[PDB]
Amino acid sequence: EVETFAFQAEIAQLMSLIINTFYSNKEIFLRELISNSSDALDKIRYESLTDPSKLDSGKELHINLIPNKQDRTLTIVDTGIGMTKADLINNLGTIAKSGTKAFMEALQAGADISMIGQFGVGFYSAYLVAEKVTVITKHNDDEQYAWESSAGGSFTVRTDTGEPMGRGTKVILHLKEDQTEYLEERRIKEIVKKHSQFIGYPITLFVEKE
Numbered sequence: 001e002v003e004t005f006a007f008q009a010e011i012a013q014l015m016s017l018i019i020n021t022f023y024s025n026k027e028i029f030l031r032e033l034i035s036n037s038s039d040a041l042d043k044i045r046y047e048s049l050t051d052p053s054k055l056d057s058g059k060e061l062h063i064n065l066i067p068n069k070q071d072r073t074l075t076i077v078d079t080g081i082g083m084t085k086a087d088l089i090n091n092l093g094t095i096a097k098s099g100t101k102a103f104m105e106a107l108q109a110g111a112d113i114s115m116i117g118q119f120g121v122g123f124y125s126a127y128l129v130a131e132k133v134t135v136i137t138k139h140n141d142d143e144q145y146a147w148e149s150s151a152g153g154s155f156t157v158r159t160d161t162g163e164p165m166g167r168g169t170k171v172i173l174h175l176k177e178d179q180t181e182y183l184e185e186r187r188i189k190e191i192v193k194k195h196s197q198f199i200g201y202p203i204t205l206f207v208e209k210e
């Protein structure tokens, strides 16, 4: 079964701002998602120092970038710590409230959208380029879940029945029709080299069969 939830009011306002503001420097979404993956890998690495069994669900710590021109999706996969159901439904929205309000204040004061990551809400920059985001995630302590939202004020959570993941997070960006440049190899490489050169995990860009 699928459960449908309302976003916290401030996050709903932030998403509406990101979708309807004219902002041409959209490539920053990819930096923010890679940064999130790097942080998630740090966290499971740290936990495994005192309990190595935490890596039973997968010892490789990496980030994969998978463009798909046929479905018009860009998928960012990491083998980091992942998210529990309580993270997806309550915790991430609750902790984001303060930074969201701070970010919207700064924006009016003079900040621009590229500072979004400094307020801890970089994930939502995905909606600069995507009309829908699907997040598949598996934490050691919980089941595999699929989160989805097309904005519009709500999100869904279901237990995922697709292929098991072991551990980590898969962010699937369903790209807007006019944002297909982020499916091009040359463009993804340009962005990673510019914004992400000092990430401490291997980033593999998959090539498309064509």
Ligand SMILES: COc1c(C)cnc(Cn2cc(C#CCC(C)(C)O)c3c(Cl)nc(N)nc32)c1C
Binding pocket: 036, 037, 040, 043, 078, 080, 081, 082, 083, 087, 088, 092, 123, 135, 147, 169, 171
């Ligand atoms: C469900 O969609 C999201 C929403 C609504 C908000 N933010 C994020 C960003 N985000 C957050 C991650 C986390 C966590 C909990 C801990 C304690 C690990 O920080 C987290 C984690 Cl663990 N991994 C990744 N790749 N992204 C994460 C996402 C993916």
